[PDB]
Amino acid sequence: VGAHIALFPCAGMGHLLPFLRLAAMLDARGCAVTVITVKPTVSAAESDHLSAFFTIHPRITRLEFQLLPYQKSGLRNDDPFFIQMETIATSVHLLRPLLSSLSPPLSAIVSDFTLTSQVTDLVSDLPISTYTLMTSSAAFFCLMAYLPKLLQIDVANRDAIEIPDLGPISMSSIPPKMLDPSDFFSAFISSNVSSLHKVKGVLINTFNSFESEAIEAVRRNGVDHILPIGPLESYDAKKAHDLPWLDEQPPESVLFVSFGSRTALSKEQIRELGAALEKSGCRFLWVLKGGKVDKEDKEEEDMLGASFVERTKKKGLIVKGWVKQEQILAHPAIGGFVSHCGWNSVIEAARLGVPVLAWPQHGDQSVNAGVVEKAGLGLWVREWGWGQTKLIGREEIAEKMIEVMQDEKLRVSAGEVRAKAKETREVDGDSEALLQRLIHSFNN
Amino acid sequence: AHIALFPCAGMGHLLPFLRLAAMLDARGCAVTVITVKPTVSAAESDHLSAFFTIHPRITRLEFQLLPYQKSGLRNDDPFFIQMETIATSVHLLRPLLSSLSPPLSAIVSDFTLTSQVTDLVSDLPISTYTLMTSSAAFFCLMAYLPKLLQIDVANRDAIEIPDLGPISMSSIPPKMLDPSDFFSAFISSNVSSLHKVKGVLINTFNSFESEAIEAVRRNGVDHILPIGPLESYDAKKAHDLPWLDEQPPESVLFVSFGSRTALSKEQIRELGAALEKSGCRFLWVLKGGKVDKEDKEEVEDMLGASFVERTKKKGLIVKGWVKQEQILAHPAIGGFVSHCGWNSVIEAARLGVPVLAWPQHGDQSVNAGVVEKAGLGLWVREWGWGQTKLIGREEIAEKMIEVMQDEKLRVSAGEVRAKAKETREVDGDSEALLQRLIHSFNN
Amino acid sequence: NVGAHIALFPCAGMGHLLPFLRLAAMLDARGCAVTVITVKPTVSAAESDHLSAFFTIHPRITRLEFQLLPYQKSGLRNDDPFFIQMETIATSVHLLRPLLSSLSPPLSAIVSDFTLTSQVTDLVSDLPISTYTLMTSSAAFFCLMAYLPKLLQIDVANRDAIEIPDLGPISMSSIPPKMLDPSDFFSAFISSNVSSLHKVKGVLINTFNSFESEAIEAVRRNGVDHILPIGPLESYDKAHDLPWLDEQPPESVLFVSFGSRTALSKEQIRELGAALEKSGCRFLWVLKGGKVDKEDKEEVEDMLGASFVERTKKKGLIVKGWVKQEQILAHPAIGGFVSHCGWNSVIEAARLGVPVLAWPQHGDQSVNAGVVEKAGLGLWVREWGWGQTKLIGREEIAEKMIEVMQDEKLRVSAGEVRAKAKETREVDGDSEALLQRLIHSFNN
Amino acid sequence: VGAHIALFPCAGMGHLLPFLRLAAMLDARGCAVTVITVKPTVSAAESDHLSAFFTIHPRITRLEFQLLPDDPFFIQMETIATSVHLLRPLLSSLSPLSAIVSDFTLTSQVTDLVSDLPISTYTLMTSSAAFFCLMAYLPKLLQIDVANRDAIEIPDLGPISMSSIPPKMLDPSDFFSAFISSNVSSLHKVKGVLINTFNSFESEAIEAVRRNGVDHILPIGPLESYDAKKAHDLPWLDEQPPESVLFVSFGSRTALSKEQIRELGAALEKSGCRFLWVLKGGKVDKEDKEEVEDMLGASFVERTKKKGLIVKGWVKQEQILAHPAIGGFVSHCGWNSVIEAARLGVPVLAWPQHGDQSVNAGVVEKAGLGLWVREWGWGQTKLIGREEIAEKMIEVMQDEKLRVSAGEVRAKAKETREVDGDSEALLQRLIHSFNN
Ligand SMILES: O=c1ccn([C@@H]2O[C@H](COP(=O)(O)OP(=O)(O)O)[C@@H](O)[C@H]2O)c(=O)[nH]1
Ligand SMILES: O=c1ccn([C@@H]2O[C@H](COP(=O)(O)OP(=O)(O)O)[C@@H](O)[C@H]2O)c(=O)[nH]1
Ligand SMILES: O=c1ccn([C@@H]2O[C@H](COP(=O)(O)OP(=O)(O)O)[C@@H](O)[C@H]2O)c(=O)[nH]1
Ligand SMILES: O=c1ccn([C@@H]2O[C@H](COP(=O)(O)OP(=O)(O)O)[C@@H](O)[C@H]2O)c(=O)[nH]1
């Protein structure tokens, strides 16, 4: 553990967990690692996860930063993660005192994409080689990467968007917010992509077989230094879960439902899947988030209904809250996965080879579904659209759930992805060799 | 894009730059604000500290200016004297600006520092912009000063500025016409170097000064950009609000004469006599000591105990810094008395307060004219120059009464208030221009 | 109430605290009433440790302590932990204003660190309090500091050397690059503070008139007229120290220390250790190897290895951590000092007439090394340059290490320095007399 | 107390002490007074006096000008001129001056200053009416004659001999001439002029200045003491009988050589006068002076230890002179001192070392205030014998007429000091003129 490295996730479970994963991974490869967190955390969950991680890994060290107050309405409405990410920039300078005192000077720092522009000054005064880890799809990341020239190019939204060395992305996959220049979200991505130039390398949670077209497209696309790190290894946070029912079930019989760290859909729609879930007869494990964005704000299982919970009393079990998704997904009993297609959830399923039913709700998740379908890892119906854009059928959903359980071709293809994913983590694997090579390059 | 703001001395110069800087930061530019020490007035120093603690990501660049060194520019004013001191030392900042870790894309300089600042970034890759504290109408007079000085052989009536109504000779300040005085030398020296500036920022909206903004555009300053009204950085802890809450809406008349303007000893007693005689409710900010806040160490021994007792029911007299923008927003204030320094004037317009115009020194008279033109307030030209003139209680009181009860003004003033709102809106020109400007900054 | 009250305000670091603590103790002896202003938390354990300990030793002196506020963006390029705190304290100096006004026994005067003189000066003015500056470094370096605004502003020239106005030219090669770069904190702090000196009633320098007559004049003639050499500051004062020395012959031991704040290159350390072995001189070696902070330098002998220690056990002993430097130099056994030539250590060596071999690492230190050579205190090799950026071979070091121990004229010269130092301390001596003179004005 | 005023003396206690008294006098008359001072001050005493003055008068504000980089006192007067602009910020921030009273030496520099910040300005002269005219008539005189004659005449003033006149003032080349001549020209700007004199002391002198175009001269003499109270010093003063003690002070600077000074020291014991002697070591500098009383010799101290006391350094002159014990004064004859003697009615012996003083001695003679020997001349020029001095010294103690003449002079001084008298009347009037 001669080399000293830090990783600095900003906000959100999707951002936070992987970086921890990168750190544990880095520690495993003889790196000395500090993990930087900024408080107060947006969600109760983020700290809960963080606390365990440090307890679980003593060798890795916690490096908190306390946030200063801010009040800017320029950011549209009130979504806390952009606000949290924005606040982090306001207090980012507070970082400098913290880095100056590090015992063995940091060889490199790994920084979440959202604040790559603020850190840059910090990265010139203290000359730290700075790296980034991408939580999104390489195909989706390819879109952001080419966004600035594409945003400069036109004023209206066309039928299909062409990123230069990649298959054109349908506009339906793209978020509205991305398209309009005036909107801030556009501002945050554009500036940050520019800051990539300063960075020594860019790391993404995907592997070359997995996104062959995109990774190369990125290569000639102005993102030369991108390294396919993924799939990010398990956090090894053992353990906090009781699953007597899961053990009883036959291997690959049970269906797992998670819509991500945040809730994805309306109750009326939600009841529709529950009704369709009954029609399918799949044994299930369902994790439900009452609060669409914050764990702290949810004190609501009223939404599914009284009759349904008793009706599926022996068919399935549901958790209202947080459960270990990878711990559950590695179980022999789980054979199908219905996800919101956040890239971390999609990547974990590919690593464990669990067939996916893609049900993207917002953001980059629609683009990840296209990768899920292109990979052959999962089944996706593009026509479902964004959440609340259309109300998709109980009867319609049931046919798709029945296909995932009884389509053997998906199982053979899903099995291949697990083998493809495993091979890249083997000593001869490009992903393991790239991580090992990057660690070798870090200076004393 | 890194932008640096270089305000000169004075809360009139200081307040606008910080306000914009906060606006720039809100809209996402990396912002640095340049301050130098010492500062003439306590408020500027106290304010800067407050502003930075409220806005953490804005960098503070502090330089100690060289000791006052001079020859020429007859100056009897402390704030103007400090401006000369900042201007003579701006050329020593070239070494510091060259090595800044996040290099500046552009500098937004103060009008007074524009000539020295333009020379400073000549061989550096930094765009030079200037923010104008005053009104657009005054800028037309500034542009015409060389023509005004050359063909000004006769002391008669007013001079017709080329694209708008002629200004009375009484409105032009006598100091502006004397080349020896600092006010004239600085105005002339800066206008000559305005052509080396990428853009000139102004605190007026297109609705407020359509003729003045248009006249300057065709008069050689073709890069003018209206961004007004500037928005408050809304940072404040001390509350002096309580008396007002007791007051009925619109009853109170607010009197203030800016950061560094004081009345005559005969005028303070005649103004006080008028406030009693009028019978109006009022809020008085008393700045008897003079410009500097530190030396104005007196504490209401200007009027005496007898007067406070008589007026306590209808008035509160405060000596010290008051949160002007907040007071103006209050339901209670239905009148304002102003020296018509532009920043007060803009605030009156944004918050729709009827204004009673009372110039004491410099641009105030022209701005007073603008205020009258737009219906914002009533101006009495005959009163002429405060500090050169004395007005009796009878005259003052009647005007005070008249402004409070002009419903046409209250209706008229509101209309300006609406227009100021529109411009800030995304459609509205002033915000749009800044949004237009901000993109430009990215290079 | 009818008694002078003097407050001392030190900055970050052992070098800046200790001179202040020592003076505070010196003043207390001479009947002054002393208060020390301290900010928590300390950058390093040692400063914390001394303060609690120091106040135990001198109960009468008041300890006035303040909280360290968050770091601010004032545009400096500092990557150092001790400099950054210096920055952090200064931003918050204005906050003290209400408190100084309200003290039970009021302040009559205060003395500021150079770093806080510009900020400190402003607070006093609304109070009837005299202001003084106590300066950590040498007169000769001080000569440079005053020049700095003039030097930065115009010449902008990379000549071989430049000349300070009433003092001989100083080689550029012996001037740190960072002093030259305006954006950097080191240049910026020196310049802003120097400019504010006109305000201070006097500037106190820990050097004596015999030691730097030429510099003292050079500064005086340059118009910061009020200069008050007080050197050398007296130990304020048993402990769990080393008895290894008590068993060593006199003059047989060579002491190596680079101060509290200097780490060394691992290459540098390996070569330096090897050099001692060839030289064969008995030695005491202190490793501030690790970080500037004692808290984060957890490295033990993992830096030198096991074999080096056993081989050298007869020859010398190496310790990592705080050592009681004053006591060690005082010991009859120590025959030579290898020092980075920081002023506090340089002055101490002069006090005890210990021959110095000069190896300046950063900042003020090269200018300091030269005077050390000049006064006949020590041997300095110019070609070695800066410790931080250049590495010196073991053999060259060993050959030099021998020379200082073997040269006996230097031992005679160092003694000459010592006698002079003794002369000032005495009631006859100008420095003691100057301090007594200073006290009487304090007592108005 | 409405009016607000400021004083500015550049250097010497010759000017500062009078100015401060002017400052105190003005405060008494209901004026807000600000005193402007130059730093660093040339003398530790000059600095010493200022701190005391503000401390003694709480309500008098102090404003200072820090200074940017022959006689120290003259050169510094030159330096203040360099930094005069520094004044500009100070005036601008003032809580504005109804008028400023400024030192004669730097009046020329300020003329520009007065005109931009409109301030009526005045100057106060610390030299005699007879001497001021010599300065006053000097500019014409230099160009017109360019020669050396035994005596020189100022239009309505009885000619005083060259022997009195200082040599340097005579030379056109010299720095001193430029300052004096230039400044008088600047004298035109001021709305008043003040000298520490009263008409009675020099009716002839005051008139000539009125005649000679110094129409605006105002004599406000004598200036009231600004003083500390109360210190139990000089138990050696209270002990002695009235008018038994001779007090010797050659200046606010040294004036004669150790051997020349030894002759008076030997003359003092032969004279038999009891004495309090103020002996300054530094020829011109208090900080420079670091010599003990070894110029007089150990022997002198043992012999006279009961008879008289020697103070090395400074003392409060007005305080000492006012004492019953003092009956004789020996003076270098600096005007400020001479005026103090007349107001306190203490007989003087005149021994002027340098400069304006010899002319000042002449005034004392016309007055009858003291006994003077002209032949003794410029200090250190010639050696004056111990035997010769005593006869004059004894004569000062035992002359009845002198006591009478001196008694009147004190009486005359008061009448102007009182409300009816002109010096008081003008002060009242000038303040009245002062406009808020
Ligand atoms: O109950 C839950 C919900 C989510 N996750 C983890 O949350 C991470 C982030 O999910 P993703 O990136 O797919 O989407 P997000 O929640 O950020 O929208 C993934 O590692 C999931 O395994 C989990 O472990 N348990
Ligand atoms: O007691 C005061 C006086 C002034 N101001 C602020 O100072 C600003 C600038 O004043 P202006 O430019 O109107 O006049 P000036 O001070 O420049 O002569 C105004 O917006 C006021 O809000 C204030 O807050 N409190
Ligand atoms: O192990 C150590 C190291 C340093 N010092 C003392 O710390 C003071 C400050 O050191 P200096 O200024 O010489 O160097 P710096 O620590 O600032 O680099 C000196 O008195 C040293 O004797 C000490 O007592 N023990
Ligand atoms: O020991 C001394 C000597 C002088 N003076 C004062 O010196 C002032 C001015 O002295 P003068 O101008 O007459 O003499 P000079 O300064 O020219 O030598 C008078 O007010 C004296 O009271 C004093 O107070 N103490």
Side-chain angles (χ1 to χ4, degrees), chain C residues 273-278 280-290 293 295-296 298-299 301-304:
Chain C
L276 292 180
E277 224 190 343
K278 231 180 296 192
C281 347
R282 259 159 277 210
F283 51 84
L284 189 47
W285 190 11
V286 170
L287 290 13
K288 267 317 324 321
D293 334 355
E295 304 212 73
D296 281 340
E298 272 161 286
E299 293 231 357
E301 307 309 345
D302 307 329
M303 38 205 310
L304 291 196

Side-chain angles (χ1 to χ4, degrees), chain C residues 37 81 121 247 273 286 385:
Chain C
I37 308 185
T121 207
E247 252 192 347
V286 170

Side-chain angles (χ1 to χ4, degrees), chain C residues 71-87:
Chain C
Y71 165 88
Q72 304 224 71
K73 282 178 83 144
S74 221
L76 274 16
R77 279 206 94 165
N78 193 18
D79 69 342
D80 187 85
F82 288 92
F83 290 151
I84 307 221
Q85 180 113 331
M86 294 198 169
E87 252 198 85

